[PDB]
Amino acid sequence: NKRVLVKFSGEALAGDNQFGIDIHVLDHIAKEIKSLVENDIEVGIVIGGGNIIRGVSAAQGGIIRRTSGDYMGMLATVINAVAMQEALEHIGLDTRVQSAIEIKEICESYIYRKAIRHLEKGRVVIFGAGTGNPFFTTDTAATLRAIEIGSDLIIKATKVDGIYDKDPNKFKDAKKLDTLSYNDALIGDIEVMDDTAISLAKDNKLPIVVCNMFKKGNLLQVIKHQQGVFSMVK
Amino acid sequence: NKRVLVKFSGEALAGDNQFGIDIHVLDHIAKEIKSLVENDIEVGIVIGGGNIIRGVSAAQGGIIRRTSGDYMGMLATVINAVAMQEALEHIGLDTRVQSAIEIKEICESYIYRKAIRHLEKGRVVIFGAGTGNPFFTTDTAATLRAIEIGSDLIIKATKVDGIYDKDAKKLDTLSYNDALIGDIEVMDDTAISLAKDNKLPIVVCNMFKKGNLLQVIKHQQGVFSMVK
Numbered sequence: 001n002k003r004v005l006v007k008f009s010g011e012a013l014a015g016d017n018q019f020g021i022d023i024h025v026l027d028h029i030a031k032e033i034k035s036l037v038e039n040d041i042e043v044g045i046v047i048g049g050g051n052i053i054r055g056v057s058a059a060q061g062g063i064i065r066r067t068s069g070d071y072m073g074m075l076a077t078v079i080n081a082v083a084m085q086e087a088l089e090h091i092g093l094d095t096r097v098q099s100a101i102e103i104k105e106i107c108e109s110y111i112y113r114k115a116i117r118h119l120e121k122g123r124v125v126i127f128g129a130g131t132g133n134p135f136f137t138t139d140t141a142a143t144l145r146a147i148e149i150g151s152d153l154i155i156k157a158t159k160v161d162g163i164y165d166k167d168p169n170k171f172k173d174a175k176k177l178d179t180l181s182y183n184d185a186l187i188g189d190i191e192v193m194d195d196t197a198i199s200l201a202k203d204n205k206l207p208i209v210v211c212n213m214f215k216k217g218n219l220l221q222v223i224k225h226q227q228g229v230f231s232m233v234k
Numbered sequence: 235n236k237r238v239l240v241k242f243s244g245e246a247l248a249g250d251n252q253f254g255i256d257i258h259v260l261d262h263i264a265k266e267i268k269s270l271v272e273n274d275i276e277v278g279i280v281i282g283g284g285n286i287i288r289g290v291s292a293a294q295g296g297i298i299r300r301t302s303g304d305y306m307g308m309l310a311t312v313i314n315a316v317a318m319q320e321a322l323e324h325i326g327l328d329t330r331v332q333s334a335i336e337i338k339e340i341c342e343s344y345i346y347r348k349a350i351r352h353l354e355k356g357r358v359v360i361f362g363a364g365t366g367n368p369f370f371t372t373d374t375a376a377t378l379r380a381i382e383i384g385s386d387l388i389i390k391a392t393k394v395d396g397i398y399d400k401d402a403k404k405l406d407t408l409s410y411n412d413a414l415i416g417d418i419e420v421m422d423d424t425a426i427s428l429a430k431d432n433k434l435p436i437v438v439c440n441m442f443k444k445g446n447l448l449q450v451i452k453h454q455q456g457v458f459s460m461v462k
């Protein structure tokens with residue numbers, strides 16, 4: 001019934017180091033997904049590739065074109081998706097990776113009715129390579145998939161409790177914002193997602209939720225009970 | 235007329251770090267490749283993925299199946315290949331990436347006859363995804379691609395000048411069996427046997443000394459160790 005899209009930056013998979021994949025961190029995440037699946041919540045997941053490679057970072061040397069740097073990023077998300085698939089299935093869950101870039105040998109291609117059939121049979125669906133367009137941020141791609149599958153909400157999983165007024169690291173006086181309007185997110189200096197993603201979520205009336213997942217049982221509490229610790233853009 | 239396969243470990247492209255892609259290193263390699271192309275040497279490149287993911291490391295703990303780890307590693311090689319291509323195209327080299335695993339939108343598949351065709355036209359071919367099979371090594375993949383394209387030799391580009399006994403001497407020439415028997419490792423056993431069976435010489439040399447590669451291929455000089 002309740003269908004959600006959980007979005008992670010690649011860094012979520014890395015832990016204390018900025019690079020790679022921390023196996024312990026991965027298992028932890030998968031167990032938070034498992035609690036959703038056990039409570040009959042349908043879970044789509046998108047993951048960025050920032051733990052492996054970045055668009056404005058590999059291009060700044062002066063020899064990697066903008067599009068090729070993105071294609072490197074897209075391949076990275078597929079690497080992360082396979083890892084996540086494995087962590088999910090290690091703990092007994094059924095999962096499919098639906099990639100926007102065709103790699104038949106490693107995962108299924110994204111097809112609208114296939115992703116839905118999987119979700120309706122209770123499989124976790126991980127969307128690899130966003131939507132295949134290089135120009136889009138992870139946030140935009142996740143919001144797109146979230147609309148495409150008719151999700152009830154999109155969860156942006158971060159390392160921080162929710163949406164704040166200033167960066168919690170750069171300010172002691174940083175105050176968490178519990179509920180925000182789409183426009184409050186657009187005009188204000190504070191950042192949630194990029195402008196395209198927020199505007200996409202606004203027009204299609206998709207609620208955005210920003211929460212920590214380091215907290216055991218929080219995700220379930222957020223999705224099923226509208227409880228736990230989170231921020232909501234509505 | 236001379237044809238060559240050059241093998242890089244993923245770790246090689248990471249530079250002064252264990253992880254990632256060093257753009258100064260890729261530039262350096264592109265220049266060396268350029269000197270081969272401009273001297274009419276046909277160049278195939280096989281690139282590793284260890285700077286990003288290795289399947290063995292990935293399977294520790296038993297969360298990721300060894301097989302899925304190896305595919306993750308094979309994808310990482312395509313990422314390196316793509317960055318390698320951009321470094322080459324940047325200095326005006328015509329290149330093609332071919333992957334043992336089909337990634338339709340980003341590069342062409344490995345096709346025996348096309349690879350050769352690209353090389354006849356003076357293009358650099360970068361082979362990603364190794365053999366396309368898990369459980370095999372970059373060394374094996376490189377040796378395979380080398381024999382497939384009809385290489386005059388395979389060059390294992392490493393950080394060291396040649397083959398040594400420790401990380402107290404350097405070893406100039408080696409038999410295939412000497413490489414299969416001894417504690418000194420050049421590549422893994424399956425790559426060496428593949429090379430032996432097909433009479434394919436193996437050069438081990440340093441990637442960082444300028445003009446060296448050109449001298450090994452064109453003149454059989456410069457600094458290097460040889461398994462034959």
Ligand SMILES: O=c1ccn([C@@H]2O[C@H](COP(=O)(O)OP(=O)(O)O)[C@@H](O)[C@H]2O)c(=O)[nH]1
Nearest residue numbers: 244282283284288289304307364365368372
């Ligand atoms: O034919 C292949 C080629 C590579 N790989 C995987 O991808 C990585 C290759 O990159 P690496 O840099 O490690 O080669 P090496 O460093 O060992 O020379 C390996 O760890 C393997 O898990 C594979 O499974 N089959």
